[PDB]
Short mmCIF file of N, CA and C and ligand atoms in Angstrom, two decimals:
data_model
loop_
_atom_site.label_atom_id
_atom_site.label_comp_id
_atom_site.label_asym_id
_atom_site.label_seq_id
_atom_site.Cartn_x
_atom_site.Cartn_y
_atom_site.Cartn_z
N UNK A 1 0.83 -1.22 0.00
CA UNK A 1 0.00 0.00 0.00
C UNK A 1 0.88 1.29 0.00
N UNK A 2 0.24 2.49 0.06
CA UNK A 2 0.89 3.79 -0.01
C UNK A 2 1.85 4.04 1.15
N UNK A 3 3.07 4.47 0.81
CA UNK A 3 4.11 4.75 1.79
C UNK A 3 4.90 6.01 1.45
N UNK A 4 5.41 6.68 2.49
CA UNK A 4 6.25 7.85 2.33
C UNK A 4 5.51 9.10 1.93
N UNK A 5 4.17 9.15 2.18
CA UNK A 5 3.35 10.30 1.85
C UNK A 5 3.30 11.29 3.01
N UNK A 6 3.30 12.58 2.66
CA UNK A 6 3.12 13.66 3.62
C UNK A 6 1.60 13.90 3.68
N UNK A 7 1.05 13.95 4.89
CA UNK A 7 -0.38 14.18 5.07
C UNK A 7 -0.65 15.69 5.02
N UNK A 8 -1.53 16.15 4.11
CA UNK A 8 -1.86 17.57 4.02
C UNK A 8 -3.13 17.87 4.80
N UNK A 9 -4.15 17.00 4.65
CA UNK A 9 -5.45 17.16 5.33
C UNK A 9 -5.92 15.74 5.81
N UNK A 10 -7.19 15.62 6.32
CA UNK A 10 -7.81 14.37 6.74
C UNK A 10 -7.75 13.31 5.62
N UNK A 11 -7.84 13.75 4.36
CA UNK A 11 -7.90 12.83 3.22
C UNK A 11 -6.95 13.06 2.05
N UNK A 12 -6.11 14.10 2.09
CA UNK A 12 -5.20 14.38 0.99
C UNK A 12 -3.77 14.17 1.44
N UNK A 13 -3.03 13.34 0.68
CA UNK A 13 -1.63 13.00 0.93
C UNK A 13 -0.78 13.36 -0.30
N UNK A 14 0.53 13.62 -0.12
CA UNK A 14 1.36 14.03 -1.25
C UNK A 14 2.76 13.47 -1.15
N UNK A 15 3.36 13.14 -2.29
CA UNK A 15 4.70 12.55 -2.34
C UNK A 15 5.40 13.01 -3.61
N UNK A 16 6.71 13.18 -3.56
CA UNK A 16 7.49 13.53 -4.76
C UNK A 16 7.77 12.17 -5.41
N UNK A 17 7.05 11.85 -6.50
CA UNK A 17 7.20 10.53 -7.10
C UNK A 17 6.73 10.57 -8.54
N UNK A 18 7.24 9.62 -9.31
CA UNK A 18 6.81 9.38 -10.65
C UNK A 18 5.56 8.54 -10.49
N UNK A 19 4.40 9.05 -10.94
CA UNK A 19 3.14 8.33 -10.81
C UNK A 19 3.18 6.92 -11.46
N UNK A 20 3.96 6.72 -12.55
CA UNK A 20 4.07 5.39 -13.18
C UNK A 20 4.78 4.45 -12.24
N UNK A 21 5.92 4.89 -11.66
CA UNK A 21 6.64 4.05 -10.72
C UNK A 21 5.83 3.76 -9.46
N UNK A 22 5.06 4.76 -9.03
CA UNK A 22 4.22 4.62 -7.87
C UNK A 22 3.11 3.59 -8.16
N UNK A 23 2.47 3.68 -9.34
CA UNK A 23 1.44 2.73 -9.73
C UNK A 23 1.97 1.31 -9.81
N UNK A 24 3.14 1.08 -10.44
CA UNK A 24 3.72 -0.26 -10.53
C UNK A 24 4.07 -0.85 -9.16
N UNK A 25 4.43 0.01 -8.20
CA UNK A 25 4.80 -0.41 -6.87
C UNK A 25 3.56 -0.79 -6.03
N UNK A 26 2.58 0.08 -5.99
CA UNK A 26 1.43 -0.10 -5.14
C UNK A 26 0.37 -0.99 -5.75
N UNK A 27 0.18 -0.85 -7.05
CA UNK A 27 -0.91 -1.48 -7.81
C UNK A 27 -2.26 -1.04 -7.17
N UNK A 28 -2.51 0.31 -7.17
CA UNK A 28 -3.71 0.84 -6.52
C UNK A 28 -4.97 0.37 -7.23
N UNK A 29 -6.10 0.47 -6.53
CA UNK A 29 -7.39 0.16 -7.15
C UNK A 29 -7.66 1.14 -8.31
N UNK A 30 -7.31 2.42 -8.11
CA UNK A 30 -7.53 3.44 -9.12
C UNK A 30 -6.29 4.30 -9.28
N UNK A 31 -5.83 4.44 -10.51
CA UNK A 31 -4.82 5.42 -10.84
C UNK A 31 -5.53 6.46 -11.73
N UNK A 32 -5.37 7.75 -11.43
CA UNK A 32 -5.96 8.80 -12.24
C UNK A 32 -5.03 9.18 -13.36
N UNK A 33 -5.59 9.31 -14.56
CA UNK A 33 -4.84 9.80 -15.69
C UNK A 33 -5.24 11.26 -15.96
N UNK A 34 -4.25 12.11 -16.30
CA UNK A 34 -4.50 13.50 -16.69
C UNK A 34 -4.82 13.45 -18.21
N UNK A 35 -6.09 13.14 -18.50
CA UNK A 35 -6.52 12.90 -19.87
C UNK A 35 -6.99 14.17 -20.59
N UNK A 36 -7.08 14.09 -21.94
CA UNK A 36 -7.73 15.12 -22.73
C UNK A 36 -9.08 14.48 -23.22
N UNK A 37 -9.98 15.30 -23.78
CA UNK A 37 -11.31 14.81 -24.19
C UNK A 37 -11.27 13.69 -25.21
N UNK A 38 -10.17 13.59 -25.95
CA UNK A 38 -10.06 12.55 -26.98
C UNK A 38 -9.39 11.25 -26.49
N UNK A 39 -8.91 11.24 -25.24
CA UNK A 39 -8.16 10.13 -24.71
C UNK A 39 -6.92 9.85 -25.58
N UNK A 40 -6.29 10.91 -26.11
CA UNK A 40 -5.05 10.77 -26.90
C UNK A 40 -3.90 10.96 -25.92
N UNK A 41 -3.29 9.85 -25.47
CA UNK A 41 -2.28 9.84 -24.41
C UNK A 41 -0.89 10.09 -24.96
N UNK A 42 -0.65 11.33 -25.38
CA UNK A 42 0.59 11.70 -26.05
C UNK A 42 1.73 12.09 -25.15
N UNK A 43 1.47 12.98 -24.20
CA UNK A 43 2.54 13.49 -23.35
C UNK A 43 2.12 13.60 -21.90
N UNK A 44 3.02 14.13 -21.07
CA UNK A 44 2.81 14.28 -19.64
C UNK A 44 2.47 12.98 -18.95
N UNK A 45 1.59 13.05 -17.95
CA UNK A 45 1.16 11.85 -17.24
C UNK A 45 0.52 10.83 -18.20
N UNK A 46 -0.33 11.30 -19.12
CA UNK A 46 -1.02 10.37 -20.05
C UNK A 46 -0.06 9.57 -20.93
N UNK A 47 0.92 10.24 -21.49
CA UNK A 47 1.90 9.57 -22.34
C UNK A 47 2.73 8.58 -21.55
N UNK A 48 3.11 8.97 -20.32
CA UNK A 48 3.90 8.09 -19.48
C UNK A 48 3.09 6.86 -19.02
N UNK A 49 1.81 7.04 -18.63
CA UNK A 49 1.00 5.90 -18.19
C UNK A 49 0.76 4.97 -19.38
N UNK A 50 0.43 5.55 -20.53
CA UNK A 50 0.17 4.76 -21.72
C UNK A 50 1.41 3.96 -22.13
N UNK A 51 2.59 4.60 -22.14
CA UNK A 51 3.82 3.89 -22.51
C UNK A 51 4.09 2.70 -21.56
N UNK A 52 3.81 2.89 -20.24
CA UNK A 52 3.99 1.82 -19.25
C UNK A 52 3.06 0.61 -19.55
N UNK A 53 1.89 0.85 -20.15
CA UNK A 53 0.98 -0.24 -20.52
C UNK A 53 1.30 -0.84 -21.89
N UNK A 54 2.44 -0.48 -22.53
CA UNK A 54 2.79 -0.99 -23.86
C UNK A 54 1.72 -0.59 -24.90
N UNK A 55 1.14 0.61 -24.73
CA UNK A 55 0.12 1.17 -25.61
C UNK A 55 -1.27 0.51 -25.46
N UNK A 56 -1.43 -0.47 -24.53
CA UNK A 56 -2.74 -1.10 -24.31
C UNK A 56 -3.78 -0.06 -23.87
N UNK A 57 -3.37 0.93 -23.05
CA UNK A 57 -4.29 1.97 -22.62
C UNK A 57 -4.82 2.78 -23.84
N UNK A 58 -3.95 3.10 -24.81
CA UNK A 58 -4.38 3.86 -26.00
C UNK A 58 -5.33 3.04 -26.87
N UNK A 59 -5.04 1.75 -27.07
CA UNK A 59 -5.90 0.88 -27.89
C UNK A 59 -7.30 0.80 -27.26
N UNK A 60 -7.33 0.61 -25.94
CA UNK A 60 -8.59 0.54 -25.23
C UNK A 60 -9.34 1.89 -25.31
N UNK A 61 -8.59 3.00 -25.16
CA UNK A 61 -9.17 4.34 -25.20
C UNK A 61 -9.74 4.66 -26.58
N UNK A 62 -9.07 4.23 -27.66
CA UNK A 62 -9.58 4.51 -29.00
C UNK A 62 -10.90 3.77 -29.23
N UNK A 63 -11.03 2.55 -28.70
CA UNK A 63 -12.29 1.81 -28.80
C UNK A 63 -13.38 2.57 -28.00
N UNK A 64 -13.02 3.07 -26.80
CA UNK A 64 -13.97 3.83 -25.97
C UNK A 64 -14.48 5.07 -26.74
N UNK A 65 -13.56 5.83 -27.37
CA UNK A 65 -13.93 7.02 -28.11
C UNK A 65 -14.77 6.67 -29.35
N UNK A 66 -14.42 5.57 -30.04
CA UNK A 66 -15.19 5.18 -31.23
C UNK A 66 -16.67 4.89 -30.84
N UNK A 67 -16.87 4.31 -29.66
CA UNK A 67 -18.20 3.95 -29.19
C UNK A 67 -18.96 5.13 -28.58
N UNK A 68 -18.27 5.93 -27.74
CA UNK A 68 -18.92 6.97 -26.95
C UNK A 68 -18.70 8.41 -27.34
N UNK A 69 -17.74 8.68 -28.21
CA UNK A 69 -17.38 10.06 -28.52
C UNK A 69 -16.51 10.62 -27.41
N UNK A 70 -16.08 11.86 -27.59
CA UNK A 70 -15.16 12.46 -26.61
C UNK A 70 -15.77 12.73 -25.24
N UNK A 71 -14.90 12.86 -24.25
CA UNK A 71 -15.34 13.23 -22.91
C UNK A 71 -15.62 14.74 -22.90
N UNK A 72 -16.17 15.25 -21.79
CA UNK A 72 -16.37 16.67 -21.63
C UNK A 72 -15.14 17.15 -20.84
N UNK A 73 -14.76 18.42 -20.97
CA UNK A 73 -13.70 19.00 -20.12
C UNK A 73 -14.36 19.08 -18.71
N UNK A 74 -13.73 18.49 -17.71
CA UNK A 74 -14.28 18.36 -16.36
C UNK A 74 -14.86 16.97 -16.10
N UNK A 75 -14.98 16.16 -17.17
CA UNK A 75 -15.54 14.83 -17.08
C UNK A 75 -14.51 13.73 -16.92
N UNK A 76 -15.00 12.49 -16.86
CA UNK A 76 -14.14 11.34 -16.67
C UNK A 76 -14.77 10.06 -17.20
N UNK A 77 -13.94 9.03 -17.32
CA UNK A 77 -14.43 7.69 -17.60
C UNK A 77 -13.51 6.70 -16.88
N UNK A 78 -14.09 5.56 -16.49
CA UNK A 78 -13.36 4.48 -15.85
C UNK A 78 -13.01 3.42 -16.89
N UNK A 79 -11.72 3.18 -17.07
CA UNK A 79 -11.25 2.14 -17.98
C UNK A 79 -10.29 1.18 -17.18
N UNK A 80 -9.71 0.18 -17.85
CA UNK A 80 -8.80 -0.74 -17.18
C UNK A 80 -7.53 0.00 -16.73
N UNK A 81 -6.94 -0.47 -15.65
CA UNK A 81 -5.65 0.06 -15.21
C UNK A 81 -4.49 -0.74 -15.78
N UNK A 82 -4.79 -1.79 -16.58
CA UNK A 82 -3.80 -2.64 -17.22
C UNK A 82 -2.80 -3.21 -16.17
N UNK A 83 -1.51 -3.04 -16.37
CA UNK A 83 -0.50 -3.54 -15.45
C UNK A 83 -0.23 -2.57 -14.27
N UNK A 84 -0.87 -1.37 -14.28
CA UNK A 84 -0.61 -0.29 -13.32
C UNK A 84 -1.58 -0.21 -12.13
N UNK A 85 -2.83 -0.64 -12.34
CA UNK A 85 -3.89 -0.45 -11.35
C UNK A 85 -5.08 -1.36 -11.71
N UNK A 86 -6.08 -1.52 -10.83
CA UNK A 86 -7.29 -2.25 -11.20
C UNK A 86 -8.01 -1.43 -12.31
N UNK A 87 -8.16 -0.13 -12.05
CA UNK A 87 -8.80 0.78 -12.97
C UNK A 87 -7.98 2.02 -13.18
N UNK A 88 -8.21 2.68 -14.32
CA UNK A 88 -7.67 3.99 -14.59
C UNK A 88 -8.86 4.93 -14.74
N UNK A 89 -8.92 5.96 -13.88
CA UNK A 89 -9.93 6.97 -13.99
C UNK A 89 -9.33 8.10 -14.84
N UNK A 90 -9.76 8.18 -16.11
CA UNK A 90 -9.28 9.20 -17.02
C UNK A 90 -10.07 10.46 -16.73
N UNK A 91 -9.42 11.48 -16.15
CA UNK A 91 -10.09 12.73 -15.80
C UNK A 91 -9.58 13.86 -16.67
N UNK A 92 -10.49 14.64 -17.27
CA UNK A 92 -10.12 15.77 -18.11
C UNK A 92 -10.16 17.07 -17.34
N UNK A 93 -9.00 17.58 -16.96
CA UNK A 93 -8.97 18.90 -16.36
C UNK A 93 -8.88 19.93 -17.49
N UNK A 94 -9.31 21.18 -17.23
CA UNK A 94 -9.17 22.22 -18.28
C UNK A 94 -7.72 22.47 -18.67
N UNK A 95 -7.47 22.61 -19.97
CA UNK A 95 -6.16 22.94 -20.47
C UNK A 95 -6.20 24.45 -20.74
N UNK A 96 -5.56 25.25 -19.87
CA UNK A 96 -5.58 26.70 -20.06
C UNK A 96 -4.73 27.14 -21.27
N UNK A 97 -3.78 26.29 -21.74
CA UNK A 97 -3.03 26.57 -22.98
C UNK A 97 -4.01 26.56 -24.20
N UNK A 98 -5.16 25.83 -24.12
CA UNK A 98 -6.18 25.82 -25.17
C UNK A 98 -7.39 26.75 -24.83
N UNK A 99 -7.22 27.65 -23.86
CA UNK A 99 -8.25 28.60 -23.43
C UNK A 99 -9.45 28.01 -22.71
N UNK A 100 -9.29 26.80 -22.11
CA UNK A 100 -10.38 26.16 -21.37
C UNK A 100 -10.60 26.82 -20.00
N UNK A 101 -11.85 26.89 -19.56
CA UNK A 101 -12.23 27.58 -18.33
C UNK A 101 -11.64 26.89 -17.10
N UNK A 102 -10.75 27.62 -16.37
CA UNK A 102 -10.11 27.11 -15.15
C UNK A 102 -11.16 26.74 -14.08
N UNK A 103 -12.37 27.33 -14.13
CA UNK A 103 -13.45 26.98 -13.20
C UNK A 103 -13.87 25.53 -13.32
N UNK A 104 -13.59 24.88 -14.48
CA UNK A 104 -13.89 23.46 -14.69
C UNK A 104 -12.96 22.52 -13.89
N UNK A 105 -11.89 23.05 -13.25
CA UNK A 105 -10.99 22.22 -12.48
C UNK A 105 -11.71 21.62 -11.27
N UNK A 106 -12.64 22.38 -10.65
CA UNK A 106 -13.38 21.82 -9.52
C UNK A 106 -14.25 20.65 -9.98
N UNK A 107 -14.94 20.80 -11.13
CA UNK A 107 -15.75 19.71 -11.69
C UNK A 107 -14.88 18.50 -11.99
N UNK A 108 -13.63 18.73 -12.48
CA UNK A 108 -12.75 17.63 -12.77
C UNK A 108 -12.41 16.86 -11.49
N UNK A 109 -12.08 17.59 -10.39
CA UNK A 109 -11.76 16.93 -9.13
C UNK A 109 -12.95 16.21 -8.52
N UNK A 110 -14.18 16.69 -8.76
CA UNK A 110 -15.37 16.01 -8.23
C UNK A 110 -15.47 14.54 -8.69
N UNK A 111 -14.86 14.22 -9.85
CA UNK A 111 -14.87 12.83 -10.29
C UNK A 111 -14.17 11.90 -9.28
N UNK A 112 -13.17 12.43 -8.52
CA UNK A 112 -12.44 11.59 -7.55
C UNK A 112 -13.37 11.09 -6.42
N UNK A 113 -14.43 11.85 -6.13
CA UNK A 113 -15.36 11.49 -5.05
C UNK A 113 -16.14 10.20 -5.27
N UNK A 114 -16.12 9.67 -6.52
CA UNK A 114 -16.79 8.41 -6.80
C UNK A 114 -15.89 7.18 -6.45
N UNK A 115 -14.66 7.42 -5.93
CA UNK A 115 -13.71 6.35 -5.65
C UNK A 115 -13.17 6.55 -4.26
N UNK A 116 -13.22 5.51 -3.41
CA UNK A 116 -12.80 5.65 -2.01
C UNK A 116 -11.32 6.00 -1.87
N UNK A 117 -10.45 5.46 -2.73
CA UNK A 117 -9.02 5.77 -2.65
C UNK A 117 -8.47 5.87 -4.07
N UNK A 118 -7.60 6.87 -4.32
CA UNK A 118 -7.00 7.01 -5.64
C UNK A 118 -5.54 7.45 -5.55
N UNK A 119 -4.74 7.00 -6.51
CA UNK A 119 -3.38 7.50 -6.77
C UNK A 119 -3.60 8.52 -7.91
N UNK A 120 -3.12 9.78 -7.77
CA UNK A 120 -3.43 10.80 -8.76
C UNK A 120 -2.37 11.85 -8.98
N UNK A 121 -2.38 12.49 -10.17
CA UNK A 121 -1.53 13.66 -10.36
C UNK A 121 -2.34 14.94 -10.04
N UNK A 122 -1.67 16.11 -10.02
CA UNK A 122 -2.41 17.37 -9.87
C UNK A 122 -3.06 17.69 -11.20
N UNK A 123 -4.39 17.80 -11.23
CA UNK A 123 -5.10 18.06 -12.48
C UNK A 123 -4.82 19.44 -13.02
N UNK A 124 -4.76 19.54 -14.35
CA UNK A 124 -4.53 20.78 -15.09
C UNK A 124 -3.15 21.40 -14.86
N UNK A 125 -2.29 20.76 -14.08
CA UNK A 125 -0.94 21.26 -13.83
C UNK A 125 0.00 20.74 -14.97
N UNK A 126 1.29 21.05 -14.91
CA UNK A 126 2.22 20.60 -15.93
C UNK A 126 1.86 21.15 -17.29
N UNK A 127 1.90 20.26 -18.31
CA UNK A 127 1.64 20.67 -19.68
C UNK A 127 0.21 21.19 -19.94
N UNK A 128 -0.72 21.02 -18.96
CA UNK A 128 -2.07 21.57 -19.07
C UNK A 128 -2.12 23.09 -18.78
N UNK A 129 -1.01 23.67 -18.29
CA UNK A 129 -0.85 25.10 -18.14
C UNK A 129 -1.32 25.83 -16.89
N UNK A 130 -2.09 25.17 -16.03
CA UNK A 130 -2.64 25.87 -14.85
C UNK A 130 -1.62 25.94 -13.71
N UNK A 131 -1.87 26.82 -12.73
CA UNK A 131 -1.00 26.96 -11.57
C UNK A 131 -1.15 25.70 -10.66
N UNK A 132 -0.07 24.95 -10.41
CA UNK A 132 -0.18 23.75 -9.56
C UNK A 132 -0.56 24.05 -8.11
N UNK A 133 -0.17 25.23 -7.58
CA UNK A 133 -0.55 25.60 -6.21
C UNK A 133 -2.09 25.73 -6.14
N UNK A 134 -2.68 26.37 -7.15
CA UNK A 134 -4.14 26.49 -7.24
C UNK A 134 -4.79 25.10 -7.41
N UNK A 135 -4.20 24.21 -8.24
CA UNK A 135 -4.74 22.86 -8.42
C UNK A 135 -4.77 22.08 -7.11
N UNK A 136 -3.70 22.20 -6.29
CA UNK A 136 -3.69 21.50 -5.00
C UNK A 136 -4.78 22.07 -4.09
N UNK A 137 -5.00 23.38 -4.12
CA UNK A 137 -6.02 24.05 -3.29
C UNK A 137 -7.40 23.55 -3.70
N UNK A 138 -7.66 23.47 -5.01
CA UNK A 138 -8.97 22.95 -5.49
C UNK A 138 -9.11 21.49 -5.10
N UNK A 139 -8.03 20.70 -5.20
CA UNK A 139 -8.07 19.31 -4.79
C UNK A 139 -8.49 19.15 -3.31
N UNK A 140 -7.77 19.82 -2.38
CA UNK A 140 -8.12 19.65 -0.96
C UNK A 140 -9.52 20.21 -0.62
N UNK A 141 -10.00 21.25 -1.36
CA UNK A 141 -11.33 21.83 -1.11
C UNK A 141 -12.46 21.09 -1.83
N UNK A 142 -12.13 20.11 -2.71
CA UNK A 142 -13.17 19.40 -3.47
C UNK A 142 -13.24 17.90 -3.20
N UNK A 143 -12.08 17.25 -3.15
CA UNK A 143 -12.00 15.82 -2.94
C UNK A 143 -12.23 15.48 -1.45
N UNK A 144 -13.19 14.57 -1.19
CA UNK A 144 -13.50 14.07 0.15
C UNK A 144 -13.01 12.64 0.37
N UNK A 145 -12.71 11.91 -0.72
CA UNK A 145 -12.19 10.56 -0.62
C UNK A 145 -10.65 10.60 -0.46
N UNK A 146 -10.01 9.44 -0.22
CA UNK A 146 -8.58 9.38 0.04
C UNK A 146 -7.75 9.52 -1.23
N UNK A 147 -7.07 10.67 -1.37
CA UNK A 147 -6.27 10.91 -2.58
C UNK A 147 -4.78 10.99 -2.26
N UNK A 148 -3.99 10.19 -2.96
CA UNK A 148 -2.56 10.14 -2.82
C UNK A 148 -1.97 10.79 -4.06
N UNK A 149 -1.48 12.02 -3.90
CA UNK A 149 -0.96 12.81 -4.99
C UNK A 149 0.50 12.53 -5.23
N UNK A 150 0.85 12.20 -6.49
CA UNK A 150 2.23 11.99 -6.91
C UNK A 150 2.68 13.24 -7.72
N UNK A 151 3.67 14.00 -7.20
CA UNK A 151 4.15 15.20 -7.87
C UNK A 151 5.53 14.85 -8.40
N UNK A 152 5.67 14.85 -9.71
CA UNK A 152 6.91 14.43 -10.37
C UNK A 152 8.10 15.34 -10.07
N UNK A 153 7.89 16.65 -10.22
CA UNK A 153 8.94 17.65 -10.07
C UNK A 153 9.27 17.91 -8.59
N UNK A 154 10.55 17.68 -8.16
CA UNK A 154 10.99 17.92 -6.76
C UNK A 154 10.82 19.37 -6.32
N UNK A 155 11.25 20.31 -7.16
CA UNK A 155 11.17 21.74 -6.87
C UNK A 155 9.72 22.18 -6.69
N UNK A 156 8.81 21.60 -7.50
CA UNK A 156 7.39 21.88 -7.37
C UNK A 156 6.85 21.25 -6.10
N UNK A 157 7.20 19.99 -5.82
CA UNK A 157 6.78 19.31 -4.60
C UNK A 157 7.14 20.15 -3.34
N UNK A 158 8.41 20.63 -3.30
CA UNK A 158 8.86 21.45 -2.18
C UNK A 158 8.08 22.76 -2.06
N UNK A 159 7.79 23.42 -3.20
CA UNK A 159 7.05 24.67 -3.21
C UNK A 159 5.57 24.43 -2.79
N UNK A 160 5.00 23.28 -3.19
CA UNK A 160 3.62 22.95 -2.83
C UNK A 160 3.51 22.73 -1.32
N UNK A 161 4.46 21.99 -0.74
CA UNK A 161 4.45 21.70 0.68
C UNK A 161 4.68 23.00 1.49
N UNK A 162 5.72 23.77 1.14
CA UNK A 162 6.07 24.99 1.87
C UNK A 162 5.02 26.09 1.82
N UNK A 163 4.23 26.16 0.74
CA UNK A 163 3.19 27.18 0.60
C UNK A 163 1.78 26.71 1.02
N UNK A 164 1.63 25.43 1.41
CA UNK A 164 0.30 24.90 1.73
C UNK A 164 -0.33 25.55 2.96
N UNK A 165 -1.55 26.05 2.78
CA UNK A 165 -2.27 26.71 3.86
C UNK A 165 -3.70 26.16 4.10
C1 W0P B 201 2.23 18.93 -12.02
C2 W0P B 201 3.59 18.55 -12.55
O1 W0P B 201 4.36 19.76 -12.64
C3 W0P B 201 5.54 19.75 -13.37
C4 W0P B 201 6.03 18.67 -14.10
C5 W0P B 201 7.24 18.78 -14.77
C6 W0P B 201 7.95 19.96 -14.72
C7 W0P B 201 7.49 21.04 -13.99
C8 W0P B 201 6.29 20.92 -13.33
F1 W0P B 201 5.82 21.97 -12.63
C9 W0P B 201 4.22 17.53 -11.60
O2 W0P B 201 5.39 17.86 -11.12
O3 W0P B 201 3.63 16.50 -11.31
#
């Protein structure tokens, strides 16, 4: 199970870790993917999770999109976790680099409330363009279930912990 996490609140924990390495180690029930509406797992967390599954996550995602169409920004879908987790909760946070409404980040985090425990990245942070300090604040103010946040960047992890209020 989860180890070496810093407790931020009653239900939010954080660690400086590669979410792929963390998923392979723990084999959580749910690993969250930082997805886009098309489930095109090209870069960031999505590209790294997909590569770890030997592209099985992308093949499965393309079948999902062919059947259901794209997700909504702020929405999610539950797919297989392949070799990384029981399930992968693909959550679409707003991409501010594409002019998506940052207010949709709270709706994106609300998807975590349907799962008792999750391994997750900070939504809309990194290549999605939003402020990670703001993403952590929305996470702790929205998620009520047990969330274990994996922050890849050490300098960001330190800044998130030192500025947490
Ligand atoms: C949210 C994401 O942020 C970064 C990733 C890579 C470089 C810089 C970052 F600020 C993370 O560390 O998990």
